[PDB]
């Protein structure tokens, strides 16, 4: 049984940027096939629709078990446009978004949509005077580390793999669709870190990443004084740089304990596990 | 006028992952329109062909000024195939790959297509016993930081931006296509850094990332002993982690001098520029 | 003219812990005389009452031109007790506290009191499981580095030094009493740092120290599960240690420029100033 | 039952600034009660006298089991005075000071009072050109982090906690008064660290802390050349800054082995203990 | 018995600098006696010969069991002259060198000479515009840190100690002379690190150090543009500096596990061993 | 004219390890010619005498303009024999040593000997239980870093460079030989650092390095308790490691200001100078 899916990427979110590859890390998974379509960073209602179109168009011949839409803020005009377009289609779907999507959480639970909401996947301080192309990449590097090293990506990966198994049953009922809200507190009900302090550091790191969103919003929308909003959006980035460093420190702690949890995929798509470095993943 | 292009992403590369977004960081560039399609990590000749087919098929009603294919090693089966196809299209193309693509560098200039080969966009330690989803994201986060902070991404940004202008002139000839190879010494032609040690550190960070590739290749393809190849690929990731630190340290030196070079796009697509934090992009 | 004041300290805060010393760092000011009194970490309406009485008690003979009450949460049973005792007395008072005092901010202005609220002065995760004397001290160590190196203490110092000038006018009216609410944005209005990146790292530090409260409260007053609130009060700590790191960084950046602002008191209470290490303060 | 003590503080010391708070970290010990009074930084024999009388004056209604005087150089004019007074009172006393108080170490056990001499509690570089309120605070944050994380505070905690138990016994004899001198070698008699290197890093931290004293004393009392003494006291601060990094490092090693010793006070005053994070204080 | 050897040092190499010392670390061995001669940094033919001549002159009365010649590039004129002179004597000789010695590896074997070529012992950026004494000393401090903490020096000590035993029996055949080529992979099969991440970080450090070689060579012998080769050689030095931090990071992991291997010499020369800090060597 | 000198190395000191090499950092000086002899780490009278006799035997035909003897404790039996032997010869001699050489400063002057005593060149923790070959090399790596990056080596280079010029004129009188004692305050009067904080961090580094000496002596010649001296000598090393980092932070402060001092030799021996990276030495 070969499962299939289509990821639609509109806008830019750390979780959307990795979501699919967290599933096929070495491109050796022979139990799955993906198609990814998007219009880049543009998430306007015009483009957002053009993408879902390419998605439905392709799905015709492709025939996926489900379609994932990932992008920032599921409550915006663009994402909302696609949020509805997918509920109308014949394909089961999941919505990957940030905290700004809790506003439409109940709405998505009714639209019959599945979703994964990453609170710590904060919006970057986009203010021409500050966020140029390089700064953008830099910010996403740090956010990527935080989400990766804290275990958030493993939580996402396990969600999309637990669904691909149900997809193999060609029966993805709305009860089989994910409905997650990831945040610092998530780690409290997991076993990601063998080292306790490595866990509270990952937690402290997630709280900070979440706090970056408010700072970015204030500086991008509320504040309009150039002499005050440029410093604000930049202070948001300095915070994420520390969030990442906190995440890196946690990992190193696992390393010292030789307990870095690794869970790769076998060619058959089975999720294997290991703690010790020289221990085979079984 | 407005320029258009389509990005195809098969397999993953640090540049391939950010290429499109590096041309519209805040998504408020009204003089460009992008589309992105691919098969994720998979890059075998079948998924590749199916992908290039997805791009050509949509290039019909999209009518792109140029098609961009990004992914690891433009000399392997999958990538070579995609070079064959796009080479024989009414659409001008550009190939984005790493160092292993220097083998087919002449064959490409022949196929009448442009290329951007980033030497420091190393191959990761893809070995089931070491690379799981999380570790795969941890690495890309280090590579992203080194590629961005060392100014490599600025090189690529400039590239596709200068092409977008000649594309608005409805004059995309092969003399206008890029034939670039990026490595540690690219920074010597640049003015990226104002502090001499920030550049020297960046050069160091690039040299190290470029070296990472030989280590990943060895562990994945040459060493056959489990006890030896797992430590080797892991050490390749330890090198990339330090390259990122060096890059970050280069960035902080620039902050120290208040000379952080920023080149954001104006709403019309023209690349502005500034050094001082509160300088206002001119 | 020798101004005099009495500091009443109940419970603990980083701002109350160093408030009087920021006014005579080397004990060489011959224009001031302070009398500090407190009941230690206990701030119940019972102890708090005994302290204010002990303060008004000696005040008669001392003759302070103003009295300062410092301790956490101005809207608490103890603090509110002392908050009315001072409004009733014939001594001009100023209330120094954390964010929880904002609920009674407008209430203090009618009581005729002055106030300075240090938002980043967050309450620690005081759970018997995690917080012991050593952990408490470590916490305040980081918190101190934050309030100091971020420039917050130079705000408190400035506020009381200006009040000490009015106290010399033998005229401290309600309009001469401070009414400040310190937070991350407070730096946007000052010229503390010569380096713009030092300030944004400072903002980031005060932004994270302020968030620390939310976590401390969630783990001390909301969460009841032992397996959860311990990791919670401990994660709040990591946040503070990392915030102290960013403060340190900002301070080091000003050092690489030798633009480290220093403002010492002359023996006559005159506040001098200097940026360069080798320049004498004027 | 409940024990009571009064803490007198003139001038500042890292140990005096924390002593009473190291006894009731969470303010939930209902088996003790303390009063705190002082003159702040000032510590001349007059300000000292006034403060000691401010403490004797309230010991009447307070009726303390023992009085404690905290401040630098217990052999100088100010402190010598306070030794006189408290020595001849119906209240048992304890003197907490630094290394310069080893001169009067004989005279103290003579005056019939207990002492706590912290050699690593070095004097800071007091020179108007270098030390402003902030530098003053920053220095204490470093000395606070060293004394706490190196386990020195644990020594003082237990010292006053053990005295507090004999005080509830209605029997505070002079053979029950403490006679201790804390130094790098004090850690050789404890079991503070489960990781030997953390111990060795802790010793190094305090060894460097002790030496900070001579650099300070020199630049303040010996060198009279501006161009030489400013850099000298500054170097004492730089040294202490590094000692704080060493102490932090010791702490982290223990976090890697999850052996962080924690000894909180039970609500009834009896000190508990633990090593593992989720262990629950026994 | 007492073994006797003569070490000739011409030119400078991290390993030739420490070689003899690594064998009698505390100068309390009773089974060895060494003589060291050389011409400092100069390794031209005239000098090398003068140096080897000094050695052979001392050898007459000193009667060395074996002779060691160490210094850069065993294939250069000066070194080659040394190989010819020592291969022509009655004394068993070992050549200590860098990667460039591989060119004459076959030639040294035909000469009955032993050798230990350390590839990570990279040449420095010897350009007059960049390399002054201080920098030359800083580079070597980092290279020394690398060669030691990664375990490369233990390999060298071992090779020699074994040759010292054979010498004690007056049984040193050409087949008893070492023929080693040390590099990153050499660590894969040692019992150096108890922590795997320490080993991995040590390999990463050796890989980088080895790479420094090419960069220095490029900026010293290839690039002729002042504006190009200066930043180039300097970047080589930034690399070594980071290799040293990796080496230190590996050493700090062992400490966290209290598994720092220590193989000290007994007064009788026997090589003891230990792992735990408090564990006595045996 | 070519200047000739012979360096004798008995025992090991950071300065005696690098002294001759600091005088010809790239091996391209045409005005100097050196011969280096020694008995490695052994500095007992028998060895030191053989070392000096080797030197005097060479001097016959080599005819040095001056001779330098380097190694620990000029006052010990071995070094004392060297002093006596050298004082009785016709060759102007200099004695390089550490703090212990101060005991015989008066003797050396009465002997017509020159000397350079580096107090920060501290003795290591030479206890069999803690110091093996690798730890001995790690300590030296840090010591070298401290002495080079703080500029102590520059003072040494200077002293010998001036002595070399006089030698070229065959005019080296006893009054021409150096009589230096280097320590933290030596830096106060040098044009080493452009950044004041760089100089202050360096002083701190030298202060601590000096302190290391006392700690090593304590654990080596005082404490006889295995359980106590082992931790103590190890703490000495931890101190030197931190001193190396201070020295490293200073150097990085200079880089930030692109003000790193480089005083390389010209092919003719002239000591050039420069500050800016791209500036040419002159
Ligand atoms: Mg032979
Ligand atoms: Mg032969
Ligand atoms: Mg003479
Ligand atoms: Mg004489």
From Swiss-Prot, chains A, B, C, D, E, F:
GO terms for molecular function: ferredoxin hydrogenase activity; methylenetetrahydromethanopterin dehydrogenase activity. Homohexamer composed of a trimer of dimers. The keyword Transferase does not apply. Pathway: One-carbon metabolism; methanogenesis from CO(2); 5,10-methylene-5,6,7,8-tetrahydromethanopterin from 5,10-methenyl-5,6,7,8-tetrahydromethanopterin (coenzyme F420 route): step 1/1. Belongs to the MTD family. InterPro entries: MTD, MTD_sf. This is F420-dependent methylenetetrahydromethanopterin dehydrogenase. The keyword Protease does not apply. It comes from the Archaea. Catalyzes the reversible reduction of methenyl-H(4)MPT(+) to methylene-H(4)MPT. It catalyses: 5,10-methylenetetrahydromethanopterin + oxidized coenzyme F420-(gamma-L-Glu)(n) + 2 H(+) = 5,10-methenyl-5,6,7,8-tetrahydromethanopterin + reduced coenzyme F420-(gamma-L-Glu)(n). Optimum temperature is 75 degrees Celsius. Keywords: Methanogenesis, One-carbon metabolism, Oxidoreductase. The gene is mtd. Residues 254-282 are annotated as: Disordered. Strictly dependent on the presence of salts for activity. It comes from Methanopyrus kandleri (strain AV19 / DSM 6324 / JCM 9639 / NBRC 100938). Its EC number is 1.5.98.1.
